[PDB]
Amino acid sequence: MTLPAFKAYDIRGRVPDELNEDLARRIGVALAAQLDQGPVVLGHDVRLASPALQEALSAGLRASGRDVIDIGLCGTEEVYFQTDYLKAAGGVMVTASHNPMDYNGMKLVREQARPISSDTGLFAIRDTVAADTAAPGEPTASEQSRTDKTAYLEHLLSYVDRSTLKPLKLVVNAGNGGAGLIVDLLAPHLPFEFVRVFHEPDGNFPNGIPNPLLPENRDATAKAVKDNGADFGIAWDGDFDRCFFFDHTGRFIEGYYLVGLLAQAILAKQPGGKVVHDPRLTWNTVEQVEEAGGIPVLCKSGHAFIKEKMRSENAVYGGEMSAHHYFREFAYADSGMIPWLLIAELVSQSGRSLADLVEARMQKFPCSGEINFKVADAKASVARVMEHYASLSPELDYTDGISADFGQWRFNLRSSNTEPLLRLNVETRGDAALLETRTQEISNLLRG
Numbered sequence: 001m002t003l004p005a006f007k008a009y010d011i012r013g014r015v016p017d018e019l020n021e022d023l024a025r026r027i028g029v030a031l032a033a034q035l036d037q038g039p040v041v042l043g044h045d046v047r048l049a050s051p052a053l054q055e056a057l058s059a060g061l062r063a064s065g066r067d068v069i070d071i072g073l074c075g076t077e078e079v080y081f082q083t084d085y086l087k088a089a090g091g092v093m094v095t096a097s098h099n100p101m102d103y104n105g106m107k108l109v110r111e112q113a114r115p116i117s118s119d120t121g122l123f124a125i126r127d128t129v130a131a132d133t134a135a136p137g138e139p140t141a142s143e144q145s146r147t148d149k150t151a152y153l154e155h156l157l158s159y160v161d162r163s164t165l166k167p168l169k170l171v172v173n174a175g176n177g178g179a180g181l182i183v184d185l186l187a188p189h190l191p192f193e194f195v196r197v198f199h200e201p202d203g204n205f206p207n208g209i210p211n212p213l214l215p216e217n218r219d220a221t222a223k224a225v226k227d228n229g230a231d232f233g234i235a236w237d238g239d240f241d242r243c244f245f246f247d248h249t250g251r252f253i254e255g256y257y258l259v260g261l262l263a264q265a266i267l268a269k270q271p272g273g274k275v276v277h278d279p280r281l282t283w284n285t286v287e288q289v290e291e292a293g294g295i296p297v298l299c300k301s302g303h304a305f306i307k308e309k310m311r312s313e314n315a316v317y318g319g320e321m322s323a324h325h326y327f328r329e330f331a332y333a334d335s336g337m338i339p340w341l342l343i344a345e346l347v348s349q350s351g352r353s354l355a356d357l358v359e360a361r362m363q364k365f366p367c368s369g370e371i372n373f374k375v376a377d378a379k380a381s382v383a384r385v386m387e388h389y390a391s392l393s394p395e396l397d398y399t400d401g402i403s404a405d406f407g408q409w410r411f412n413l414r415s416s417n418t419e420p421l422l423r424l425n426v427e428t429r430g431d432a433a434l435l436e437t438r439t440q441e442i443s444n445l446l447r448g
């Protein structure tokens, strides 16, 4: 066996059998052997065990001669930002993001907040931790507390012209994660009126775990928007590296359409830039990037692949349909804060509602949304789909699973890299009927 908590992109497991303070301390020791010279930034989310897991991680790091910069209770993107800003050797965010309350985990980065993933150091760390039976050493390095968010807040605000912002009314739903702390620190500098839902950090999660995809968290944001006549609503997951938008009618906006929207917003500030996008849903992003003078760059989905493609291309912005938005000036890292600041600026400057900014795009490229399948035999199921459509001779692309372009419609079908599931995405050229019949047809073949 191997330690189950070590996944493709991060560490995540149930406390205390899959992850605990002893493992966390051993991970700190193993991490110190993987990084270049320098201190290590540590931060944590609102979960009840997160401070103790961070303290054990710090004890292992300092036993191995690493200075620790403790940035405290924060979002995942603040570990990214400070690791790069403070020119640290690496950083660790203690978080389970959006998972149940008996779970925790870690997200690990090296210099410039470059991700540490299964094939780029994480499984080396796993195997070291798995074999480590050494007595815990004592600290030969210090911990400094640096909770000042000023540089982070100034960086977030640098993405918008504050003199162009209008006093929009914005619903904000932290889900009792950590997003509300940053909202409240930004608010004195912004003209918006905030309608705060589930705002207080509470790792007991009295209102449900912080996953805005659950229709119950979704309904709380939508109800707040409609009941207050808000311009739009924003919800985050627990560590707020993901943000989700609700228009003025309470309608949840499919993340696909935010990629094209944000790309156009960014390309207005950085003309001619490259924009990285994933292969699941593409046509709208390609068109909107090109219309704004940008250059679209196809990349396999998954944050390590997006970030690495962005670096190699000097891309100004990258976006995934799964509510991950990455920014070159932000150490090529994802933020759940920059996106809504950019959208609020767009609404303020254009005089258009978020609903109408995306309405015509949704009509032009309707999509199924991501549909997940747990089947007995994924490989045979995929083969059944491809054999069925073979006689239509689609254009096939293997960047990330299978992409099949039939002309007026296309689909992407891939295996998940974080769960054992098939994921389906379908889109069409302005044809909702074709979208439904092809989506149902593929769903039937997969389930066969």
Ligand SMILES: O=P(O)(O)O[C@@]1(CF)O[C@H](CO)[C@@H](O)[C@H](O)[C@H]1O
Pocket: 009, 301, 302, 303, 304, 320, 321, 322, 324, 415, 416, 417, 418, 419, 423
């Ligand atoms: O499909 P997954 O399981 O492979 O990966 C997912 C699941 F949300 O998580 C990755 C990192 O958070 C994202 O970067 C993917 O875009 C996203 O889809």
Ligand SMILES: [Mg+2]
Pocket: 076, 097, 098, 237, 238, 239, 240, 241, 242
């Ligand atoms: Mg998250």
